[PDB]
Structure formats: C-alpha cells, structure tokens
C-alpha cells in the first residue's frame, strides 16, 4: 500500500536565519508527490540515505526506533525509546528481545531529554551524516483518516547526536505508519517575514517547477 | 576482489551424519558472510546471514560460525531433504563474490 | 506474495547484444537495491551487478565491467540489464535478486526470481 506525500518532509536545511527571501538549496529531501509506503502493525526496513517517518498513532503505541546494521550484539546500535516523562537515547552492542533488549554491553553514547512524541500527525526525518544523527520533527493536528494531509509545514531540528556509527537498517518499536526515503534534490524555499518556511518548489518535479526555480519565483 | 574458497568440493554423507563445510576468504571479511543452499533447477535459498544468524523458517539442525577468514557451515544431522549444493558469499565489499560450491550427496 | 520475474532471454550471436528485464511485485521495490547474478551450466554462482534504490550508483563485476549496464525504472517496478558485446563465456542463467546485505543495500530479506537463460552462439 502507498500514499502520496504531496508536499511533506521538508525541513530547515541549516541553522542560518533568513527572512522575506527565496533560497535555493541542494540537500536530501523527500521528492514531491513521491510514493510513501503505508505500513500496518512490523518489518525491518533499509535506511538508505535517510528516512521520512510519519504516524497518527498515540505516543503509547509507537515507542521509538532502532537504527543500526546487523541489529544484534555484534555491532553498535542506536536505540531511541520514549516513555511518559522522558526520551532515552543510547548506543550500545544491544541484544534485542523478540522491555526492548536483554543486554546492553559496550555502551559508547547516552543522552536524555524531554519526550519526542480528530488526530495529531507526527512527522520525523532521520539523517546520518559524518557521524551525526540528525533528527527533525513537527507535530500538527489532522482531520484525515486514510492518507497524508495536503499543505506545507516545515520540520524543525530536534536533536543532533554525535554517535559516530553507520546505519543501514532500522525498525519501529511498537507497544499504522508511513515510510519514505530522501533523495538529493534541489528545492526553492520561501521564507516569510518571521523566517518561517511557508512554501517550497521541487525543481525536478515538472517543467512548471523548473521554470519557477529558474526565475526564482512562485 | 576477495577470493572465496570452499572445502571439500564434494562430500558424501548418510542420514543422521554430521556434515561440515569450510569456507575461507583471502581477506578478513569480519562476519559478513552468507550461506546459500541450491537444488537443481531452482534459485539459491539463504540459510545463514552475518556468519551465524539463522534465517526464519530454517531448521534448527543448521548452524554456522566463524570470523575473519575462516568460516564453518554445519548440519548436525543430515536429512534426505538436505541434499544440495552449498555456497558461501561475502558482502564485506564490492564486487560481491560466491565460493566454488560444495556438493553434498548420499 | 513476493515475486521477481525475469524475461528477455533467448539466443544471440557473439558480438551481439541482449536486454533483460525483471518485473518486481509484492514488495517495496523502490526502497531496495537490486542485484544481478548469473549461473553458467554446470557452474557455481557469479555476481554480475548492483544498483542502489534511486538508481543513482552502479557497480559491476570486473568480468562484465564496460560491457554490461544496469538500470531501473521505479515507476514500473522493473529492473533492467543491458548486455553488449556478448561472448560465448556469457552463456548463463540470469537471475534478478534482492540479496540480504547488512552493509550496502540494507535489505533484511532475500528474494530471487526463477532465472532466464541467455545463450551466445
Ligand atoms: C506511484 O505508484 C503508482 C502506482 O500505484 C504509479 O502509477 C505512480 O507513477 C508512482 N509515482 C511515483 C512518483 O513513483
Ligand atoms: C523514563 O526513563 C527514565 C530514564 O530511564 C526514567 O528515569 C523514568 O522514570 C522513566 N519514566 C517512567 C514513567 O518510567
Ligand atoms: C567497547 O567498544 C570498543 C570499540 O569502539 C572496543 O575497543 C572496546 O574493547 C569495547 N569494550 C568492551 C568492554 O567490550
Ligand atoms: C509574523 O509574526 C507576527 C507576530 O510578530 C504575526 O502577526 C504575523 O502574522 C506573522 N507572519 C506570518 C506570515 O505568519
Ligand atoms: C556508511 O556505510 C556506507 C556503505 O554504503 C558508506 O558508503 C558510508 O560512507 C559510511 N558512512 C560513514 C560515516 O562511515
């Protein structure tokens, strides 16, 4: 099953403040109107160059994610788990079960912060570049039942973790979600007077978008 | 390119016998080795990944272990349905390579 | 049900060319990298080529490098292999496959097609 990410998965590409300007950036983005896999639940998926993840399920249903390679005790793995009061992020040679793991030896990284998670849609972007695991997120109300919403909303930086490991595969920890993949695309991003991205053009979507990017206009 | 070698190229075994197949890499491939089982006229089936991780649906009589250059595939008790050619494959780096193939018969 | 169906095999002359295709269904084709593997009559398995999920990066075996080209169309869920300057040594059954690989493709599942025979004579 597939759904249409009409204009979803756009995030602030850097930490530079901009306002009242159209900025052209080359980065890993979810291509506009791409096919996003619609999962019900819970398989192990490839990470590729980065992952777009979205769900409308409650915080007590989707607990977190595991990122790594062999996802066993042979290598370092990244475990992100939320609970009622906090979020715990660890990198260890975990031996996962089937409450998530039986052992966590050779730990190299630990981080603790506030929780990451008519309905409410939660969107995340996971990137792993030069040893840094970058997470972007957005939380927005939604009135849809069988698909992704239309409209534009940019995702903000949530955390940037100096974990220093390679990620090739990942799995969602459950107690109904969408998965897409990022590609190297050129986007024209529109910043309003408050420095908020309110729109975007995918310069490689169609002839009209190409024209808009060329002329730097919407 | 990593050269893959297997030994024996062929072995005979009865039902209930223990069968061991050796696979050796010319380079240290850590634990990035797959084991396949192929029967005549069919595509290869994966039995073991990451040197020693068993695939789902694979009988408990199958096992494997090893690290670096020397790996072993074992059938603790050969069954009539285990008559096949076994291959080892490394995916530590590209190009990927398969070993010669070890033929097991009665 | 996951399926991979090879087609486009047949008999060609030495120095000629043949294009194979593999129709994929039952799985998220555009999320996985894909491999071609060939097996000559009476011989073992030989890896031929690999393509990433976006079709961007391509890798070949030294024995076919410069003669074979790998490509994919993610809108048709179809994998292709274009073989030029075919030699007698290229006679083999060609398979498309998703090989379990924790380092490069990130595939957690292993899938194979039935294979298609290419004869050079
Ligand atoms: C999405 O999948 C449909 C088939 O369900 C296909 O017709 C369409 O072209 C695909 N779109 C993209 C961007 O791949
Ligand atoms: C959440 O995890 C933290 C760290 O392990 C722990 O101190 C806290 O008590 C947990 N919250 C609940 C409700 O268990
Ligand atoms: C922890 O991992 C490092 C590799 O990053 C390794 O060198 C060290 O020996 C490990 N420590 C233990 C107790 O296993
Ligand atoms: C920018 O922020 C001001 C409040 O300082 C608000 O009134 C205005 O509507 C915002 N502009 C946009 C486009 O949201
Ligand atoms: C992670 O592994 C991939 C394997 O395809 C490699 O290309 C990439 O450079 C590695 N990244 C790091 C930081 O080692």
The CATH number given to B4-104 is 2.60.40.10
| Residue A11 DSSP code | B
C-alpha span between C68 and C81 (Å, rounded): 7
At residue C77, the 3 state secondary structure works out as coil
User: Long-range CB contacts (< 8 A, 24+ apart) of C52-56?
Assistant: C52/A48, C52/C105, C53/A46, C53/A48, C53/A181, C53/C105, C54/A49, C54/A183, C56/A184
Q: Total structural domains in chain C?
A: 1
CATH of the domain at A118: 2.60.120.960
C-alpha span between A217 and A22 (Å, rounded): 8
The domain containing residue A75 runs over which residues?
2-215
Contact of A94 with A73, CB cutoff 8 Å: yes
At residue A214, the 3 state secondary structure works out as helix
Going by C-beta distance under 8 Å and a sequence separation of 6 or more, which residues neighbour residue A210? A203, A204
C-alpha span between A181 and A193 (Å, rounded): 31
Task: Specify the ligand 1 atom closest to the Cα of C30.
Answer: 14
Q: Total structural domains in chain A?
A: 1
Name the β-bridge partners of A110: A90
Contact of A190 with A202, CB cutoff 8 Å: no
Structure tokens at C36: 């071609």
* Closest to A79 measured CA to CA, from A98, A104, A49, A58: A104
Question: Distance from C26 to chain A by nearest Cα, in Å?
Answer: 10
Backbone angles phi, psi at A88, to 5 degrees: -115, 125
- Number of neighbouring beta carbons within 10 Å of residue A33: 13
The domain containing residue C50 runs over which residues?
3-120
- Give all chains having 3 or more CB-to-CB distances under 8 Å with chain A: B, C
CATH of the domain at C35: 2.60.40.10
Upper half-sphere CA count for residue B47 (Cβ side, 13 Å): 22
Upper half-sphere CA count for residue A180 (Cβ side, 13 Å): 27
* Closest to C107 measured CA to CA, from A182, A48, A57: A48
C-alpha span between B45 and B86 (Å, rounded): 10
At residue C31, the 3 state secondary structure works out as helix
Between the alpha carbon of residue C116 and those of residues A39, A71, A197, A211, C40, the distances in Å are: 33, 35, 51, 45, 11
State the best of B3, B5, B91, B99 to mutate against chain C, taking most chain C CBs within 10 Å.
Answer: B91
- Number of neighbouring beta carbons within 10 Å of residue A180: 24
For this PDB entry, the determination method is: cryo-EM
Q: Resolution reached, in Å?
A: 3.0
Sequence length of chain B is 106
């Amino acid at each position: 099953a597939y759904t249409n990410s009409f204009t979803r998965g756009v995030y602030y590409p850097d930490k530079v403040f901009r306002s009242s300007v159209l900025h052209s950036t080359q980065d890993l983005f979810l291509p506009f109107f791409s096919n996003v896999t619609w999962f019900h639940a819970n398989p192990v998926l490839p990470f590729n160059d980065g992952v777009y993840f979205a769900s409308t399920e409650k915080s007590n249903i989707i607990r977190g994610w595991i990122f790594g390679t062999t996802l066993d005790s042979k290598t370092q793995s990244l475990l992100i788990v939320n609970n009622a009061t906090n979020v715990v992020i660890k990198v260890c040679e975990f031996q996962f079960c089937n409450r998530v793991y039986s052992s966590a030896n050779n730990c190299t990284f630990e981080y603790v912060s506030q929780p990451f998670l008519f309905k409410n849609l939660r969107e995340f972007v996971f990137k792993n570049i030069d040893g840094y695991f970058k997470i972007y997120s957005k939380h927005t109300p939604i009135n849809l039942v069988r698909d992704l919403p239309q409209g534009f909303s940019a995702l903000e930086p949530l955390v940037d973790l100096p974990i220093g490991i390679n990620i090739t595969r990942f799995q969602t920890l459950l107690a109904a979600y969408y998965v897409g993949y990022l590609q190297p695309r050129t986007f024209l991003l529109k910043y309003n007077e408050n420095g908020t991205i309110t729109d975007a053009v995918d310069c490689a979507l169609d002839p009209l978008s190409e024209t808009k990017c060329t002329l730097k206009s919407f | 390119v990593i050269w893959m070698t297997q030994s024996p190229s062929s072995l005979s075994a009865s039902v209930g016998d223990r069968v061991t197949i050796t696979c050796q890499a010319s380079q240290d491939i850590r634990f990035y080795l797959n084991w396949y089982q192929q029967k005549p006229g069919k595509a290869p089936k994966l039995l073991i990944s990451d040197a020693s991780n068993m695939e789902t649906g694979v009988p408990s009589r199958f096992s494997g272990s090893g690290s670096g250059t020397d790996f072993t595939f074992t059938i603790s008790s050969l069954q009539p349905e285990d008559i096949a050619t076994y291959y080892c494959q490394q995916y530590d780096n590209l190009p990927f390579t398969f070993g010669p193939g070890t033929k097991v018969d009665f | 049900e996951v399926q991979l169906v090879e087609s486009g095999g047949g008999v060609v002359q030495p120095g000629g060319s043949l294009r194979l295709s593999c129709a994929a269904s039952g799985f998220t084709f555009n999320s996985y990298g894909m491999h071609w593997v060939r097996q000559a009559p009476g011989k073992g398995l030989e890896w031929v080529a690999f393509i990433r999920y976006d079709g961007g990066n391509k890798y070949y075996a030294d024995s076919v490098k410069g003669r074979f080209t790998i490509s994919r169309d993610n809108s048709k869920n179809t994998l292709y292999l274009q073989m030029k300057s075919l030699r007698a040594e290229d006679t083999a059954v060609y398979y498309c496959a998703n090989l379990k690989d924790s380092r490069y493709s990130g595939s957690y599942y292993d899938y194979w097609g039935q294979g298609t025979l290419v004869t050079v004579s």
